[PDB]
Structure formats: C-alpha cells, structure tokens
Ligand binder design. Structure first.
Ligand SMILES: *[C@@H]1O[C@H](CO)[C@@H](O[C@@H]2O[C@H](CO)[C@@H](O)[C@H](O)[C@H]2NC(C)=O)[C@H](O)[C@H]1NC(C)=O
Ligand SMILES: *[C@@H]1O[C@H](CO)[C@@H](O[C@@H]2O[C@H](CO)[C@@H](O)[C@H](O)[C@H]2NC(C)=O)[C@H](O)[C@H]1NC(C)=O
Ligand SMILES: *[C@@H]1O[C@H](CO)[C@@H](O[C@@H]2O[C@H](CO)[C@@H](O)[C@H](O)[C@H]2NC(C)=O)[C@H](O)[C@H]1NC(C)=O
Ligand SMILES: Cc1ccc(-c2ncc(Cl)cc2-c2ccc(S(C)(=O)=O)cc2)cn1
Ligand SMILES: [Fe+3]
Ligand SMILES: [Zn+2]
Ligand SMILES: [Zn+2]
Length: 341
C-alpha cells in the first residue's frame, strides 16, 4: 500500500536492493530484470513502481507514459544555501577521454579506433557521441565507424561487442547490466584504463572518481589524472581540469521514473527513504547508505548528494530539454511516433 517496488537491473543491483528492502522494514521491495528496457516493461505492467534512469532511457520510458519523479542532485558550489532537495539540478558533462600517451589522437582521427561506451541508448556513452558522429559523417552506419567497441546492448556478434569481456567466467558478454565488466561509467572508463579501447565516452565525474587514489579498486589504484586527456570538438586535447571548455554536451541528470498514476506515492516514500539512508540520514553511515556501493553506481550514482524535487512539474520532454530530445530523435531515425514495447 505505502509500499514501493523498486526494479533492479542485474544481480548486484538486486543484492543492494534486498539490503535496502530489509533495512526499510519492507516499505521498499525489489523486482529484478536483466535489462533496463525489461525494468521499464515491469513498470508499465504495474509489477514494479520505479527505478532511476539515465536520460536516454527517460526518453524511452517517456514515450511509454512514464514520468520523471525526482532527480539525482550532486554537490555544487552554487545554490549552496538552498537545501539539496529543493536545489535545481545542474546536469553533467559528457566527455570523450583518451590516454595522454596516445599522442595525436583527436576528435578528427577517431575513425577506425577502438571505443568504450557505457551502453547503447545512454546519454554520454551513446546518444551524444554517436549523434555527433552521424551528423559529421552524414551517414547512419555508426556500426562501421570504430574498428571495435564495447557497447553493452549491441549484438554480441558485431564489432560493437568485440571488446566487451562479460563476467568472472566470460558469460554475459555485452549484456547491458553490471555483470558486463565494461558496463556503465565505471566499466567504460576501465575499458580505456586497461587499454582495451582508445576512447571512453563517459561523464566528467567518472575520470575524477577513478584517479589519484579516489577508488582503491585494483585496476584504478594507480591511475593518475595527468595520464588522461579530454577530446574537444575543435580538434584539440585538454587536461581533465578543463571539462567546462572541452565537453561534448551537458546531460540532464539521472532521474527516478514511474507510471504517472504512481508518481505521488513513489515521491512520498522516496523522500522518507532518503531522510533515513541518504547522505546525512539517520541510518546511513550506521545501518545502510542508499548512495554508496563502492564505485559501482548501483541503483543510484555514488556521487549523489540527494534526490531533488523537480519544479515546473515537467513532462519527460521538458525534463530532458528540446536540445537533447531533438538530438535523440535525429539519431533514432537511423535505427514513427510510438512506445517501443
Ligand atoms: C514504513 O512506512 C511507515 C508508513 O509510512 C512509517 O511509519 C511512519 O513513520 C513516521 C516517522 O518515520 C511516523 O511519524 C508515522 O507515525 C508513521 N506513519 C504511518 C502512516 O504509520 C515507517 O516509519 C516506515 N518504516 C521504515 C523503516 O522506513
Ligand atoms: C568534474 O567532476 C569532478 C568530480 O565530481 C568535480 O570536482 C568536484 O567538485 C566539488 C565542488 O563542486 C568538490 O567539492 C569535490 O571535491 C570535487 N571532486 C573530486 C573528487 O575532486 C569537478 O567540479 C567537475 N568539473 C566540472 C567543470 O564540472
Ligand atoms: C544532428 O543534426 C540535426 C539536424 O540539424 C540536429 O537537429 C537540429 O538541432 C537544432 C538545435 O537543437 C535545432 O534548432 C533544429 O531544429 C534541429 N533540426 C532538426 C532536423 O530537428 C541535431 O541536434 C544534431 N545532433 C547533435 C547530437 O548535435
Ligand atoms: C535540468 C534541466 C532543466 C531544464 C532543461 C531544459 N528544458 C527545456 C529546454 Cl528547451 C532546454 C533546457 C536546457 C538545455 C541546456 C541547458 S544548459 C545551458 O546546457 O545548461 C539548460 C537548459 C534541461 N535540464
Ligand atoms: Fe548518464
Ligand atoms: Zn557546453
Ligand atoms: Zn510544463
């Protein structure tokens, strides 16, 4: 009744969710799916209530009648007086990242290189960079641009999955969930850091969180910020300190979506949940922290300060902005107004 079913994507998000369910006294319970698209389907069927989604997926869900409820809000030097829950969201920077030692690799020489993407249909990892690449080459053959890639969610037999590694045992190669070694912001950046690919399409924060001792994960332990360069659209290379002037776009934050008819109830429960397990929650350090999962970004990104109310009660279109929405529509016509399911 006053109970929310969260939808977890893959085994590890399932495990974190079960802990949260336990700690919440069953105020929250868990449904699990293998993919984000399958979680969207459970929500439409009314078998789950909610999940936190990247902007590219909000666009998928929004066409199907799902609505943004609360957005991820990270720390900011601006609006610093305003409480996190009421502070406007700032958006993240989509960047292209290379090794400094890979000299003379720039935006203009990306053709036939190796690429690392968060997953197909995601903002920084797919929609922004490929949309730019389609526009620039005047071609929809984006599956032919890079020699090899890890792009979780693409056909496991295509070059777009050639670089993906799967799990501990080599199973689940290229699945769009965290069982895939090179899935997500962290996975894509690991793909570049291990020199599997030449370029990673991630966000600004990913580089900072996985370098200079911020991680302690074995692959990231010894990574230094100075060994990385951002690719800018003017053909130039800059230090990772210069992302404000060398990004591909600003992305709308990840947000919680639900069926319109459930939005009010999902909102109320979630606000109470973060009071308990959020950043300064009554139980977070002590019993359970919603926004931690040791660099793995499970259910929520680890850099989330809070979930913020929206303001202007936006539709999914207003939430994403006319900039981003036209970008996705233009790319989607390479792959007609309907829910995909
Ligand atoms: C699970 O949900 C119930 C119902 O919302 C919570 O009980 C409320 O808790 C607040 C403060 O935390 C009390 O002041 C109210 O009297 C309760 N309201 C109702 C409607 O019973 C309960 O706290 C939640 N449990 C957990 C662990 O999250
Ligand atoms: C790129 O991302 C990093 C990491 O999120 C940002 O650096 C953080 O900035 C906040 C202040 O806004 C600091 O309190 C944190 O300590 C910083 N994080 C780390 C780990 O150093 C940085 O601002 C981002 N760059 C831009 C231009 O947005
Ligand atoms: C790729 O090209 C298309 C076509 O120009 C871009 O779509 C235009 O975007 C601008 C700015 O939002 C609008 O003023 C135009 O109305 C759009 N035209 C169309 C056909 O819708 C699209 O934004 C480009 N993709 C990327 C990622 O930059
Ligand atoms: C968080 C958020 C709120 C609103 C919007 C938005 N909704 C509609 C339209 Cl037409 C545009 C935008 C919008 C697009 C880009 C930028 S910027 C300058 O890159 O920060 C700001 C706002 C985009 N993001
Ligand atoms: Fe994203
Ligand atoms: Zn910009
Ligand atoms: Zn409106």
């Amino acid at each position: 009744y006053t109970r929310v079913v969260w939808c977890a994507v893959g085994p590890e998000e399932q495990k974190k969710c079960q802990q949260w369910s336990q700690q919440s006294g069953q105020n929250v319970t868990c449904a699990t799916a293998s993919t984000t698209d399958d979680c969207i389907v459970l929500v439409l069927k009314g078998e789950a209530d909610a999940l936190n989604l990247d902007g590219g997926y909000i666009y998928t869900a929004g066409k199907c009648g799902l609505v943004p409820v609360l957005a991820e809000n990270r720390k900011s030097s601006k609006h610093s007086s305003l409480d996190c829950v009421l502070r406007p969201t700032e958006g993240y920077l989509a960047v292209a990242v290379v090794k400094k030692a890979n000299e003379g690799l720039t935006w203009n020489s990306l053709k036939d290189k190796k690429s690392c993407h968060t997953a197909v249909d995601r903002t920084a990892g797919w929609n922004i960079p490929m949309g730019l690449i389609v526009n620039q080459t005047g071609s929809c053959a984006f599956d032919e641009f890079f020699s090899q890639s890890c792009a979780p969610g693409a056909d496991p037999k295509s070059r777009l999955c050639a670089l993906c590694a799967g799990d501990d045992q080599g199973l689940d190669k290229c699945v769009p969930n965290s069982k895939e070694k090179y899935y997500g912001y962290t996975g894509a950046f690991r793909c570049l850091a291990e020199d599997v690919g030449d370029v990673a399409f991630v966000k600004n924060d990913t580089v900072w969180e996985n370098t200079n001792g911020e991680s302690t994960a074995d692959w990231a332990k010894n990574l230094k910020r100075e060994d990385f360069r951002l690719l800018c659209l003017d053909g130039t290379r800059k230090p990772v300190t210069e992302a404000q002037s060398c990004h591909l776009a600003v992305a709308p934050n990840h947000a919680v979506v639900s069926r319109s008819d459930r939005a009010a109830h999902v909102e109320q429960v979630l606000l109470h949940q973060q009071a308990l397990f959020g950043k300064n929650g009554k139980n977070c350090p002590d019993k359970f922290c919603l926004f931690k999962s040791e660099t793995k970004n499970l259910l929520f990104n680890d850099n989330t300060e809070c979930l913020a109310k929206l303001g202007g009660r936006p539709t999914y279109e207003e939430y994403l902005g006319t900039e981003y929405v036209t970008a996705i529509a233009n790319l989607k016509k390479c792959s007609l107004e309907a829910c995909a399911f």
